[PDB]
């Protein structure tokens with residue numbers, strides 16, 4: 001049979017999670033992907049992702065993150081793959097000059113999250129490998145940390161398939177035909193139907209959501225990360241060097257302690273190239289900005305980590321104008337759920353988004369507050 005209860009189109013961060021939460025409750029599921037997840041053509045590779053809880057971008061993100069973390073700890077117990085390590089997350093920036101730092105500190109206070117404050121040289125006294133100007137301030141969230149993103153997806157896939165999920169790889173969906181009774185997807189090697197549809201195509205949502213007659217502002221961006229050889233005594237996870245997300249003079253950078261000699265991983269969040277996901281150049285170094293922007297940060301703030309570029313990765317964000325997610329039912333078809341526009345900060349929530357999508361596909365509603373992620377909101381018109 002080519003009929004399923006639910007088809008998930010795009011089996012990456014959000015879709016593979018949805019497939020797991022569906023399949024584990026006995027929902028007959030088909031997961032369809034253009035590639036073989038986890039892979040290096042979407043938004044989930046580069047090994048590691050930050051999860052943090054002191055989310056200043058809006059109050060609704062906080063219970064979403066707290067649920068996500070509960071779900072990650074549950075996944076850790078079910079698989080042999082490593083899911084999460086509690087590095088803590090350091091946020092810093094200029095005193096009275098970083099909306100991001102201020103909003104984080106306020107969030108940590110409002111929601112009563114465990115944290116510690118540092119000013120200036122106090123940062124370096126805690127972690128030798130970081131140096132900031134005297135007028136910088138910082139907040140450290142010790143309970144947050146790092147997800148091994150490719151492991152997360154692989155674990156969800158293995159568990160979903162063992163529960164009965166069917167996974168179709170190297171099979172791009174070319175079109176959708178939907179009614180309220182029947183969902184049909186068209187591919188090169190044939191068609192499949194279901195009762196319900198979950199659409200979670202990452203950067204390709206920006207090209208293919210038009211096939212469901214949904215028109216929203218989504219812009220893919222090419223975002224690189226580099227791994228640098230570094231003094232392990234200062235920058236290893238074994239030395240308790242934290243993951244970080246910081247605001248400096250030219251914007252926001254994020255990074256990770258070295259794990260097993262991977263080197264320190266760093267990305268520049270505040271710039272990337274506007275791209276089409278079918279023609280993006282996935283070679284690190286293809287643009288001179290790739291390495292240059294990373295070294296400018298390291299030589300100033302983490303000078304002992306400004307070593308050999310061991311490797312690089314090219315990844316994509318998909319941004320909405322307000323940088324809030326889109327998680328909703330299709331306005332015409334109550335049997336179609338859409339997850340899009342994660343704006344470079346969606347991985348940490350992929351567990352709870354998966355759970356939400358499974359609830360939406362299965363019941364038409366969710367217990368979680370997704371009010372700020374709606375399709376009908378003014379920023380998307």
Ligand SMILES: *Cc1cc2c(cc1C)nc1c(=O)[nH]c(=O)nc-1n2C[C@H](O)[C@H](O)[C@H](O)COP(=O)(O)OP(=O)(O)OC[C@H]1O[C@@H](n2cnc3c(N)ncnc32)[C@H](O)[C@@H]1O
Pocket residue numbers: 009010011012013014015032033034035037041042043044046048049050051171172173174200201202203204205208223224225254267315316317339340342343344345346347348349
């Ligand atoms: C790239 C980036 C993102 C990022 C990050 C650093 C970089 C360099 N750092 C993060 C961080 O530390 N903390 C965090 O919470 N998120 C961070 N991110 C953002 C995050 O990775 C993304 O928001 C998230 O991965 C997006 O998930 P999504 O599920 O939306 O995207 P995907 O994993 O790429 O999955 C999409 C899948 O769909 C398949 N596809 C595409 N088109 C089709 C068609 N036509 N048919 C079938 N399948 C399709 C893709 O192949 C992919 O598997």
Ligand SMILES: [Cl-]
Pocket residue numbers: 043316317318319341342343344345346
């Ligand atoms: Cl994204």
